[PDB]
């Protein structure tokens, strides 16, 4: 089984540069192309150039000829793009895919921002008789005020996903981020079941596990 | 450079029914080896793009056999016969024939489902937000389907502006519907100089608005 993984987010600095890494797995790495595309936040997809690891031949976009230089480690068997010069045109998903676009990375997010990281609070959204109908009850978590993206949450660890809605953040007038996640349970349930929304927001190392009790 | 077109943004389609999705290209993709060099790849939310076709008429391997491409050298569509609830996604189309290669701007895969007015939920702040001298006041529309729906806020009945974010989820792989949320953003001093706080709802499957309320205190 082929892979293709990528390096993790990075949050970086107006005017530095950044190196992201696709690192190749269950194939022949200098046997194949890997090509790098670029993806800005709701928007359609871009290419920026592709690498021979055999040959280290490269061809680039010419739109991204002064921001990317493609490179290939065949040792690790590994393939890096360095973008240069970075200001928040450059705040986006990378990713890495093998030549034609079958087998693809998982995306690097790259954050360009002078704004410091802050973890957020989380806040439970307690289920009422306001959000209970019909036997159903609605509860949730707030995770208010973090900056940069993304924070990912889950129910239970991860035993509880039918009836979850985990809504898109939204960026605050104040420029942090906030998002809630929220699920239907049976409201039979909200005196025997605990629930618990598991909060990562990984640029602040923050987790929390969030109890939502009744009220 | 080839430029790639795809005149819709989206397309409806009701499961079992089929779809064609269009792309055209500024400049033949036919190569003298015979091919045609289009790709059609479809991205899920949240998901890294999938290869769909592949030389413009050729199933890419695993990809079901209700997925088909054809076309000339500069018009294309990707058909997808029988489509499931699951196939909600962006379809681009992209050329591999000359550098620089390019995407069209991508075509959303609507799934036409029964309307379906939303369920209503409002959350007061929590007591703990509250200690942190802030109140977030959350209205939950749930499982509606068309994706339209305004929410209106309304403090002591009087109309809010300008204090409220709405965050709207893509279209459900199962059941097709989308969800929303309101969150009015108020001072805890603000926020307790009131004591009736409503979300009004507007919705194609609703004949009239519907309004949820708390009042502060319980
Ligand atoms: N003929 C292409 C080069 C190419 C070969 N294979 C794929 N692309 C060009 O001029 O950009």
């Known amino acids: 089984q082929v892979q293709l993984q990528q390096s993790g987010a990075e949050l970086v600095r107006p005017g530095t540069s950044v190196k992201v890494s696709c690192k190749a797995s269950?194939?022949?790495?200098?046997?194949?192309?890997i090509e790098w595309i670029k993806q800005r936040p709701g928007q359609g997809l871009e290419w920026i150039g592709v690498?021979?690891?055999?040959?280290?031949?490269?061809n680039y976009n010419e739109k991204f000829r002064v921001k990317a230089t493609l490179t290939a480690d065949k040792s690790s068997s590994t393939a890096y793009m360095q973008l240069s010069s970075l200001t928040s045109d450059d705040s986006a998903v990378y990713f890495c895919?093998?030549?034609?676009?079958?087998?693809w990375g998982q995306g690097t997010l790259v954050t360009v921002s002078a704004a410091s990281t802050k973890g957020p609070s989380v806040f439970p959204l307690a289920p009422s008789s306001k959000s209970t109908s019909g036997g159903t009850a609605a509860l949730g978590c707030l995770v208010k005020d973090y900056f940069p993206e993304p924070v990912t949450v889950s129910w239970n660890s991860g035993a509880l996903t039918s009836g979850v809605h985990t809504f898109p953040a939204v960026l605050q007038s104040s420029g942090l981020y906030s998002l809630s996640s929220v699920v239907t349970v049976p409201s039979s349930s909200l005196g025997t079941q605990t629930y618990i929304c598991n909060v990562n927001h990984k640029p602040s190392n923050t987790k929390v596990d969030k109890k939502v009790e009744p009220k | 450079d080839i430029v790639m077109t795809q005149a819709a943004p989206s397309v409806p389609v009701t499961p079992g029914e089929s779809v064609s999705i269009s792309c055209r290209s500024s400049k033949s993709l036919l190569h003298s080896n015979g091919n045609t060099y289009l790709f059609w790849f479809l991205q899920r939310p949240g998901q890294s793009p999938q290869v769909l076709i592949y030389?413009?008429?050729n199933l890419a391997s695993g990809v079901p056999d209700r997925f088909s491409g054809s076309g000339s050298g500069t018009a294309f569509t990707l058909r997808i016969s029988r489509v499931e609830a699951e196939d909600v996604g962006v379809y681009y189309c992209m050329q591999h024939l000359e550098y620089p290669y390019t995407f069209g701007s991508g075509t959303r895969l609507e799934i036409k489902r029964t309307v379906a007015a939303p369920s209503v939920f409002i959350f007061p702040p929590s007591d703990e937000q509250l200690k942190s001298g802030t109140a977030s006041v959350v209205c939950l529309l749930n499982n509606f389907y068309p994706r339209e729906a305004k929410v209106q806020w309304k403090v002591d009945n009087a109309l809010q502006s300008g204090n409220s974010q709405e965050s709207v989820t893509e279209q459900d792989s199962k059941d097709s519907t989308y969800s929303l949320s309101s969150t009015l953003t108020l001072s805890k001093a603000d926020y307790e100089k009131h004591k009736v706080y409503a979300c009004e709802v507007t919705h194609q499957g609703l004949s009239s608005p519907v309004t949820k309320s708390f009042n502060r205190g319980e």
């Open positions: 030389r413009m008429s």
């Open positions: 269950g194939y022949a790495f200098t046997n194949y192309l």
């Open positions: 895919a093998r030549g034609g676009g079958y087998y």
């Open positions: 690498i021979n690891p055999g040959s280290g031949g490269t």
